[PDB]
């Protein structure tokens, strides 16, 4: 089954950007049957597809395959891919808390 995890990522400055050190796939505008990480291939949610060795997300405990449920209290289960990306990369936010589930 899935276990709930709560991680707290402190973004890393890389030049002008604040970065999280991971990648995402999914979103309501994408084909969920293409998601290799989900248990249920109708799941249109946002999944962690890669984590950078030594980066903020790794340090915080994020793992490849995690499903992102919320970012700073903001629901991520019914958003487009771009909407998810934007929520994760707000320039004004250095700290982001992710609610995730992990198989």
């Amino acid at each position: 089954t899935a276990v709930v995890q709560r991680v707290e990522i402190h973004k890393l400055r890389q030049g002008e950007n604040l970065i999280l050190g991971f990648s995402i796939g999914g979103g309501i505008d994408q084909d969920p049957s293409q998601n290799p990480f989900s248990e249920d291939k109708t799941d249109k949610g946002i999944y962690v597809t890669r984590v950078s060795e030594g980066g903020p997300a790794e340090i915080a405990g994020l793992q490849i395959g995690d499903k992102i449920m919320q970012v700073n209290g903001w629901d991520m289960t019914m958003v487009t891919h771009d909407q998810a990306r934007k929520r994760l990369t707000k320039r004004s936010e250095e700290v982001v808390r992710l609610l995730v589930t992990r198989q």
């Binding site: 970065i19 999280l20 991971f22 990648s23 995402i24 796939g25 994408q30 084909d31 293409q34 998601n35 597809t49 890669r50 891919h81 990306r85 994760l88 990369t89």
Partner: peptide, 10 residues
């Protein structure tokens, strides 16, 4: 990578 399933670096 999968052209039918984009990923984004953040």
């Amino acid at each position: 990578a999968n052209s039918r399933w984009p990923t984004s670096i953040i």
